[PDB]
Ligand binder design. Structure first.
Ligand code: HEM
Ligand code: HEM
Ligand code: HEM
Ligand code: HEM
Ligand code: HEM
Lengths: 235, 239, 235, 239, 235
């Protein structure tokens, strides 16, 4: 649990879709397949954290998503090849896959002391909250800017977001060089209209036009314990 | 002996558009079994008729790579999720390949207050009464320029947008969903009409205003279909 | 036959490709399947026109194309769902699909009377000729122009095409709002080298630069009676 | 034993490039049946050897998602069409997925007359004599700017294009096909070479001239292969 | 092994993904299938070099990657068609495929002599290190520039990269004319956070803005002996 907050921690987003031929299995065999998976997760639960999301019926061409924290992607690599080896995995098509390490804040030091104070707040306490993942690539312009400039952009970014700081938990991952994006943004909320308004707000700052890629995909789901998701496939 | 249905009109209501295409192996089922599969779905939908509203569209032979579409209204997307996961679980669902999927909430109008009072009067109108009309769906994403603008400016764009559309308010039903943050688009537009020739002209008119050049994504896909009750649509697959 | 020419007529372009698993079928069943299709077409030949094109060996990822005219798309939809319901249809992957109504001319009134006269010509009589289909989408600039302006463009367009009025039959469909394009252009010819020069001619006017989508796909085929095309699959 | 093809050089001659990829299930055939399948094709080619020329290239392991390519010459694409549908009918064809497909007529040179006389002389050279050489194909589409130009301008561009290429005139055979209106590109370029490193240099040189920025589409795909007799290519499928 | 450094040597990057129907094979068949492959590679180890990478769980839609060195692509070609012919190959969908020859340095001579000193270094010794592959295409602007200009860009590229020469091995392949890219870049490292920073650094120079294609795909994997990779598939 000191992974959801600490730096140097790699964070991975893996998406899967269940095959059609899965339903041509006897119902029990599916239940046994579930147990295989459930056992594997616990077997790794010492080295890594694993969270589950139901994308089925919210995200196109996706049923399930894992969010995996680990000090090294090697450990994460092993976990996923193993998961895809199970009887259940063998009927899963690997969808999206994105890595990004959590880093120490980069621009907040140049913010007003009154703005830093409010950023210690992160999000509401919630159970079965919605979850959103949005990958981002900046344009070349953005990197060419100087520190003072970007600091001012992020400061305007932060400002527009302040009224949604309680109803929206947030986490940021640094993905450059591990895949075709710069950032992976991750959000939890019970109030989706709030998240919608939060995004339309951020769409109006300067920073935004420098997003060469925004979404594609925009993953929407529900946070749920793993077994409950698997239950749906074993009936 | 009847009920409210306060959803096709009210705000705060999420609206979801789901597309499906039927597998080849579906026809490798005996006809008898397929009709039962139909009954399963009709029953599931009825089982949900209290929590959500669900309308059905036949895309087969009008929209590329799509046979069926649902329009699903709900106070929460969780309910819509549950419904769709259940639907994709049925014998019929197990033979459907999930196509497109888009969400958007219905809001109260944003720019309409700054229109002339004579224009607001005409906008109370939405469409004439028709049965089994054509239906169109167009996802839209605006460019960054558009958001950089101020309220007064966008209001003029929308006022010009509205002006061009006025001649088509009766022959074309319309509804708008605010989709930003739930997927890769800003808006979902939905239209019903008996006169497609009119809907065609309605669009080429809008192509000529200012606003249009700010549509970073327009369609892709542009889903065209026919509104029909679910069983009649399903009946076609049980033969 | 007043469908190939009149206005208010919807025109539909449907493309298909045959599955591999089709040849793993006994020959008997395939010939029977052909007969099934031939009959369906006959039933609709009263309400609609349906023409057949062999794209196999000329257009990538396509074997067959239908051109369907109708007073209403509802009728066309019915025919197409039915064709894809047939034993043979069930072994087809639905390729492209484009609609467009035929309209009354928009810019021709503002042409010189000598130019209107030469446009009375449409094309030479040819049997089992090549056929080409090109979808078109205009940029926003094109729509921003005024009538006088666009009329001059089409007039420059018309001019370059005149030497090809006999060797190239032509028809135009208005597709905006029924799919992701503004126009569907359709041509028949025995002389492909002429059609090539015709397009290289038109590539040099102004109008052309306003075509944000040109082709994609560019469908090339041969016009043929339906049965002769199906015969190849019945062996 | 006494005849001229007169197709690899003459104008008015259509040229077609067809790419195929083999199904997995092809190997689920007994080796014997697969060798039989080969002969079916070799015979078909001879049966057509009167009407068309057909050259074969092995793309498997050099060009992504493509195993086999044919280069087909014909006075009419109709003849090519028939040949290809017949080929896709063979036992082997039935297990081939149609990949890329591009047509283009060979024409008389357009800009070369306005070149210096010393440059026309060196262009009579085309390439060195080689057996089983590498082969490259690059489809190309020009931008609208390019067509807007006048003849004098374009002629000046091609002269710099030509100038840059001269040092590679010997190690690289070349042929150009005019494809506009038959598919989604303007030209199909074709090259043979024993020396790929030269061909690499040939291209990086041309990347630096005037003409180049007007190539709206360059490659996509860029097909690389080996020129080989048909049977040798086919033997590999029967193991 | 005199190939990993020398010029005139072709270098090829081939990526594969395993079908589902592979697991519908009995283990006995799969062990036999692996054995064929291990044997095939040994059969070629005399003419060419072949290194193996595990992409499973790190790169989307990819399980395995080969890095193949050869004096001629024909030899590389022969090897790959054979590999794809094997019982195991029959169940692989060919993912990416990229070739590029290694050349002698082009811009480095015009660098400071103190910089040349630092470039003799390439990387630290590691076993089973991460590996990243990044394809690159330059824009037309880049080629239009003169030697003096491009030389200054690469010197700026080089300067920013100097701090990472020890923790990051590098090799560059010249790909123009063999596929749809100008370069193939290849990196080994045990330290991924460093590689991430290396890339964010280069994102801030000028050269970067001329990369019309950067990644797509960005292949991330683990270096492992082949048998160890195939073992996972034989269970
Ligand atoms: C309550 C909501 C949010 C708050 C308070 C917030 C605030 C911040 C702050 C303070 C930073 C500075 C991080 C640093 O200094 O390294 C940041 C970075 C960033 N945010 Fe947000 N943010 C919010 C939501 C979002 C959303 C909704 C998105 C995208 C849809 C987003 C995209 C980004 C990106 C891409 C960066 C990194 C830019 C860079 O370091 O170059 N953020 N945000
Ligand atoms: C008879 C037909 C139509 C009428 C009367 C109409 C009228 C309006 C009005 C009054 C608004 C402002 C509502 C608000 O305050 O949010 C609006 C918004 C909008 N309309 Fe339409 N419209 C019509 C057709 C269309 C069509 C055919 C399209 C696209 C194909 C379209 C796209 C949009 C979009 C994207 C917005 C919201 C833009 C924004 O809020 O930034 N409309 N329309
Ligand atoms: C002999 C060959 C051709 C002739 C005589 C011809 C002539 C014309 C004329 C007179 C119009 C104006 C229609 C009107 O005013 O209502 C028109 C429209 C159009 N043509 Fe052609 N054309 C030819 C070939 C082509 C080709 C080969 C293409 C595309 C590859 C093409 C694309 C278009 C498009 C997109 C329009 C609609 C523009 C608009 O209404 O805004 N035409 N053509
Ligand atoms: C030894 C190598 C080459 C030589 C000597 C050469 C020379 C020429 C010459 C003299 C022409 C004018 C032909 C005409 O009158 O249409 C031409 C046309 C053309 N070349 Fe090359 N070229 C070479 C390589 C290439 C390469 C490597 C490419 C592309 C990868 C290429 C692309 C083209 C195109 C697209 C045209 C037609 C342009 C037009 O007609 O508008 N050429 N070449
Ligand atoms: C420690 C890390 C690195 C060092 C010391 C380095 C150094 C160099 C040097 C000296 C050259 C010029 C060689 C020549 O004259 O051809 C070069 C070329 C190049 N480098 Fe790097 N580089 C490093 C990392 C990277 C990375 C991380 C990337 C891409 C993500 C990259 C992309 C390229 C490309 C595309 C070229 C081709 C330039 C050309 O020859 O036109 N390099 N590098």
């Amino acid at each position: 649990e000191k992974l959801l907050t600490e730096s140097g921690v790699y964070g991975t987003f893996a998406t899967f879709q269940m095959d059609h031929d899965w339903w041509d299995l006897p119902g029990e065999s599916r239940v046994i397949s579930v147990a295989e998976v459930k056992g594997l997760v616990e077997q790794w639960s010492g080295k890594i954290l694993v969270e589950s999301y139901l994308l089925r019926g919210l995200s196109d061409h996706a049923d399930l998503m894992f969010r995996v924290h680990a000090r090294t992607l090697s450990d994460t690599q092993q976990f996923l090849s193993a998961f895809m080896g199970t009887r259940l995995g063998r009927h899963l098509t690997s969808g999206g896959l994105l890595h990004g390490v959590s880093k120490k804040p980069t621009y907040v030091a140049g913010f007003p002391e009154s703005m830093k104070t409010e950023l210690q707040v992160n999000g509401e306490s919630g159970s079965r909250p919605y979850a959103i993942v949005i990958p981002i690539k900046k344009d070349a312009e953005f990197w060419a800017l100087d520190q003072e400039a970007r600091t001012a952009l992020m400061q305007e970014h932060t400002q527009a977001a302040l009224p949604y700081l309680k109803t929206v938990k947030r986490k940021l991952y640094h993905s450059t060089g591990l895949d075709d994006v710069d950032f992976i943004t991750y959000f939890e909320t019970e109030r989706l209209e709030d998240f919608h308004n939060l995004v339309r707000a951020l769409q109006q700052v300067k920073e935004f036009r420098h997003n060469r890629r925004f979404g594609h995909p925009t993953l929407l789901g529900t946070m749920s314990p793993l077994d409950e998701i698997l239950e749906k496939f074993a009936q």
